[PDB]
Design a protein around this nucleic acid. Sequence first.
RNA 1: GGCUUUUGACCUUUAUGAA
RNA 2: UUCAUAAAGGUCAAAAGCC
Length: 347
Amino acid sequence: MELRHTPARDLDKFIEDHLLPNTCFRTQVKEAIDIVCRFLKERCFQGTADPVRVSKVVKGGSSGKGTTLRGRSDADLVVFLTKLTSFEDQLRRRGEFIQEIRRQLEACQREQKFKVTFEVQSPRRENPRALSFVLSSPQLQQEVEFDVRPAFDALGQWTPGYKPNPEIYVQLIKECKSRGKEGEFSTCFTELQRDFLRNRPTKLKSLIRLVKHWYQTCKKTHGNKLPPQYALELLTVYAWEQGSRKTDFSTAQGFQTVLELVLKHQKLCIFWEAYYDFTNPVVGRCMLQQLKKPRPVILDPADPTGNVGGGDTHSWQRLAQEARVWLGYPCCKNLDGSLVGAWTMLQ
RNA sequence: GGCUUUUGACCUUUAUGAA
RNA sequence: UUCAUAAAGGUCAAAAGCC
Ligand SMILES: Nc1ncnc2c1ncn2[C@@H]1O[C@H](COP(=O)(O)CP(=O)(O)OP(=O)(O)O)[C@@H](O)[C@H]1O
Ligand SMILES: [Mg+2]
Ligand SMILES: [Mg+2]
């Protein structure tokens, strides 16, 4: 049964039946992650005469957040290398480490330990930001898709709960404003992005799944011309924080609220102070700049240079058209045909 | 009320890499 | 000691499906 035909009272059942991970899926992925992690820690750089060390492999993305879609969520890994020493460095040397990681993976395949399938993407253009591939192992019951990124460890050993030293963002902003980049180093702060969602209430994670599924369904019609998926994820968090703040709430009202916020994209200016704030003048000046951009502005809680909004109003136009149609579906409607109603946003 | 799953919190333990 | 990935054991909670 398609989401498109599911009424409001069955959305939680729909999430349960199609979207939530089952035991096998999340078990096989964690096995696949283990294979790649061991490889990176025990093999991949053991050949370098000048030792390249991996300080940590961070499981990011939906996998680290607990918002994965069953049988559809990739594994996102950020591998932190001791020899990348700064944002400048990561930006210039990321290409090398990718290629090298590719070679060693090949040399493992050649050995019959597992099988990897990459996908050439042309034109190559700017250095690659990631290495993507599919993994297959006699060990595993299924294949898992991967996304691997090398990164400079800006945070050091970071403990969830603490705001990162502002001087780290001072430095971030300095390089970004000099090289004309914005949001290019969000991977270094993956752990903050993971922390922003990991501890949220269970049903909120479930709604995020639903919104993600709706968004993927939209992509069938619009390909890659939509705003970034992360924008919608953050938009869902914003909806809950201003309209509920409760562990229990109606999924349909949540769904409707999000769809309505999409239609109001020309008024969206959303940001958080979970990891930075206006205290430090430099960080403060950069936040303020971002909030003066054309709407919608959705500021990455982990990255003050990062407007997840995407800066492309055609994308939001397209997404808004779909939001208009989906508001006529049984998804947000009661039994009598009336809409369940959206939450109302605190200041 | 009963059965179970998913997602987190806290306290232990094992392997691997790193500071 | 701490950080990361996987596994194991104990305890607590949230939400969901089913009866
Ligand atoms: N536009 C963006 N700006 C900043 N960070 C982003 C971003 N897009 C993605 N990210 C970060 O990189 C992670 C991996 O992205 P994706 O794999 O593309 C989606 P996901 O969040 O993993 O869910 P999904 O893979 O289950 O669909 C995201 O969770 C987010 O933390
Ligand atoms: Mg992902
Ligand atoms: Mg990914």
